[PDB]
């Protein structure tokens, strides 16, 4: 009943694109692909913080469990969720 | 923005251990693996190894047989350990980043953002030593010059005429002989008609060794 | 071990060209492929990683593409900032290797090479030593090979090159090459020569001296 | 539903986010009654980009083909 080949946890299905991108080239991605990133809420309190940890979060920072974040230049890994 | 420094000996004697250290602030030092890539002077560019803050090392298979790389993770620092210098190790050191932070699953990144400015490591027994300048006698446009060779360490200052000569020079970049001292060759081409009249001096200067040399050229006979 | 090549060794473009370095591997890397520039003195400095992805900050007339065994980087025109040397760099099974490196040099006429040659002086003949310079003066392109011929025999081994950059007025390169040997060896020949092969020649120069 | 993890025809992997040696990661997966994936059975599926350069089953990493791995410290999956 559901081809997500990712992480599914409440109807959303989260699909890990490992390559590094900035914020910006990661949110239009997911944009393109009719997805967001995820919401840092949405999974700090799941078990899907083990995944999702360090990549993009819909907030524009790094989803962490958790100095001086300069976190405009760097490129990290995220994952779409979408329907 | 994440900053690196390096330190070290920045001249070993052959067979003695190199040892250099890395300095890292601006960002997370237990989230990215750290390489030391060395490249030999006017030569290409090789990888040596990288280390991670849980102490897992890769090393190039070419030098496993004499690189360390260690970390000090409450220091934010790791160093390098080459064993067995030779003369072939004579390279610039930078210490970098792995610009992809490691997450311990997936894909590997594979890139090295930011670099080190570099610590320059010489291979020679060589003590410091003053140079010695031979003249390149000049034989239509003639050519003659300074030979200032057998020399350590750099650099050497080479003017001509107290700097009063300065078009159609060429001070060649100092070459490391296989003796462990710099030979270098410093030009200039004049016009056949002022080699009767324009006396032509060459003055070396070398600082490290305190030694001012005004050696005349003189044309053959 | 993959090995990676970058042709050519020397690009040759004015001002405001486009440029486009080339770099093809053993086998297949898929797209863990990086590309950096180098100035002279400086350390090197990514520009694209992923084979396709800019750097921060990197201007967007740099791009990269390719996957697998064959990747170009392209600059679409040509800065005076971007005469440098670009290095290729992959990674695989376990273990990272760069490319020779492509330098880019400002295009000129092919000129000549002025080949001089310098007997040992005296001063350093006493000293037990003998070093012959041979003298390439104000050539181009870069590309230049110099042989040492002691009684029409091929040296190898006792000779050091040492390359000027790229002329600020005339864009143009010099070369020294410096064959040192001993008093007795050199005192057991006495044709000496220098021979320079260049695209700007028509035929190989030697320059002789008898000792 | 119950699957905290990746599902691929059956079989759920559960990531462990601890660094550890080969045999505590293999120790850890037998104490919840599980195995280390097998190279084979993810290398040609899309669970490669998650349990690449974790351990395997065969005692190395498993990573997209390839060809001392005694004193290293990675995560793991337990199925």
């Given at each position: 009943?559901?081809?997500?080949?990712?992480?599914?946890?409440?109807?959303?299905?989260?699909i890990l694109h490992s390559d590094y991108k900035s914020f910006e080239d990661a949110k239009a991605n997911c944009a393109a692909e009719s997805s967001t990133l995820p919401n840092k809420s949405d999974?700090?309190?799941?078990?899907?913080?083990?995944?999702?940890?360090?990549?993009?979060?819909?907030?524009?920072?790094?989803?962490?469990?958790?100095?001086?974040?300069?976190?405009?230049?760097?490129?990290?890994?995220?994952?779409?969720?979408?329907? | 923005?994440?900053?690196?420094?390096?330190?070290?000996?920045?001249?070993?004697?052959?067979?003695?251990?190199?040892?250099?250290?890395?300095?890292?602030?601006?960002?997370?030092?237990?989230?990215?693996?750290?390489?030391?890539?060395?490249?030999?002077?006017?030569?290409?560019?090789?990888?040596?190894?990288?280390?991670?803050?849980?102490?897992?090392?890769?090393?190039?298979?070419?030098?496993?047989?004499?690189?360390?790389?260690?970390?000090?993770?409450?220091?934010?620092?790791?160093?390098?350990?080459?064993?067995?210098?030779?003369?072939?190790?004579?390279?610039?050191?930078?210490?970098?980043?792995?610009?992809?932070?490691?997450?311990?699953?997936?894909?590997?990144?594979?890139?090295?953002?930011?670099?080190?400015?570099?610590?320059?490591?010489?291979?020679?027994?060589?003590?410091?030593?003053?140079?010695?300048?031979?003249?390149?006698?000049?034989?239509?446009?003639?050519?003659?010059?300074?030979?200032?060779?057998?020399?350590?360490?750099?650099?050497?200052?080479?003017?001509?005429?107290?700097?009063?000569?300065?078009?159609?020079?060429?001070?060649?970049?100092?070459?490391?002989?296989?003796?462990?001292?710099?030979?270098?060759?410093?030009?200039?081409?004049?016009?056949?008609?002022?080699?009767?009249?324009?006396?032509?001096?060459?003055?070396?200067?070398?600082?490290?060794?305190?030694?001012?040399?005004?050696?005349?050229?003189?044309?053959?006979? | 071990?993959?090995?990676?090549?970058?042709?050519?060794?020397?690009?040759?473009?004015?001002?405001?060209?486009?440029?486009?370095?080339?770099?093809?591997?053993?086998?297949?890397?898929?797209?863990?492929?990086?590309?950096?520039?180098?100035?002279?003195?400086?350390?090197?400095?990514?520009?694209?990683?992923?084979?396709?992805?800019?750097?921060?900050?990197?201007?967007?007339?740099?791009?990269?593409?390719?996957?697998?065994?064959?990747?170009?980087?392209?600059?679409?025109?040509?800065?005076?900032?971007?005469?440098?040397?670009?290095?290729?760099?992959?990674?695989?099974?376990?273990?990272?290797?760069?490319?020779?490196?492509?330098?880019?040099?400002?295009?000129?006429?092919?000129?000549?090479?002025?080949?001089?040659?310098?007997?040992?002086?005296?001063?350093?003949?006493?000293?037990?030593?003998?070093?012959?310079?041979?003298?390439?003066?104000?050539?181009?392109?870069?590309?230049?090979?110099?042989?040492?011929?002691?009684?029409?025999?091929?040296?190898?081994?006792?000779?050091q090159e040492s390359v000027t950059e790229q002329d600020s007025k005339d864009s143009t390169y010099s070369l020294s090459s410096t064959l040192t040997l001993s008093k007795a060896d050199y005192e057991?020949?006495?044709?000496?020569?220098?021979?320079?092969?260049?695209?700007?020649?028509?035929?190989?120069?030697?320059?002789?001296?008898?000792?």
């Open positions: 009943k559901e081809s997500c080949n990712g992480l599914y946890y409440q109807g959303s299905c989260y999974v700090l309190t799941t078990w899907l913080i083990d995944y999702v940890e360090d990549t993009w979060g819909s907030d524009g920072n790094p989803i962490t469990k958790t100095q001086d974040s300069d976190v405009s230049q760097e490129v990290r890994k995220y994952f779409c969720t979408g329907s | 923005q994440v900053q690196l420094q390096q330190w070290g000996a920045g001249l070993l004697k052959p067979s003695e251990t190199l040892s250099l250290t890395c300095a890292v602030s601006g960002a997370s030092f237990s989230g990215y693996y750290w390489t030391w890539i060395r490249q030999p002077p006017g030569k290409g560019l090789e990888w040596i190894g990288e280390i991670h803050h849980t102490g897992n090392t890769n090393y190039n298979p070419s030098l496993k047989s004499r690189v360390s790389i260690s970390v000090d993770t409450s220091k934010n620092q790791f160093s390098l350990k080459l064993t067995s210098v030779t003369a072939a190790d004579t390279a610039v050191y930078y210490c970098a980043r792995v610009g992809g932070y490691y997450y311990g699953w997936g894909k590997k990144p594979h890139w090295f953002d930011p670099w080190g400015q570099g610590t320059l490591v010489t291979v020679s027994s060589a003590s410091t030593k003053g140079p010695s300048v031979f003249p390149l006698a000049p034989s239509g446009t003639a050519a003659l010059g300074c030979l200032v060779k057998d020399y350590f360490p750099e650099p050497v200052t080479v003017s001509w005429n107290s700097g009063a000569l300065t078009s159609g020079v060429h001070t060649f970049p100092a070459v490391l002989q296989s003796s462990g001292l710099y030979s270098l060759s410093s030009v200039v081409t004049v016009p056949s008609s002022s080699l009767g009249t324009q006396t032509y001096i060459c003055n070396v200067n070398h600082k490290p060794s305190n030694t001012k040399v005004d050696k005349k050229v003189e044309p053959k006979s | 071990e993959i090995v990676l090549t970058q042709s050519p060794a020397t690009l040759s473009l004015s001002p405001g060209e486009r440029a486009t370095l080339s770099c093809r591997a053993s086998q297949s890397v898929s797209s863990d492929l990086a590309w950096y520039q180098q100035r002279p003195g400086q350390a090197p400095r990514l520009l694209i990683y992923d084979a396709s992805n800019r750097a921060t900050g990197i201007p967007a007339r740099f791009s990269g593409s390719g996957s697998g065994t064959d990747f170009t980087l392209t600059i679409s025109s040509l800065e005076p900032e971007d005469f440098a040397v670009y290095y290729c760099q992959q990674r695989s099974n376990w273990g990272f290797t760069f490319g020779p490196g492509t330098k880019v040099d400002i295009k000129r006429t092919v000129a000549a090479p002025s080949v001089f040659i310098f007997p040992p002086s005296d001063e350093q003949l006493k000293s037990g030593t003998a070093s012959v310079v041979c003298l390439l003066n104000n050539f181009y392109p870069r590309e230049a090979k110099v042989q040492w011929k002691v009684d029409n025999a091929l040296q190898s081994g006792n000779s057991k020949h006495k044709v000496y020569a220098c021979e320079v092969t260049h695209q700007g020649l028509s035929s190989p120069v030697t320059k002789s001296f008898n000792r």
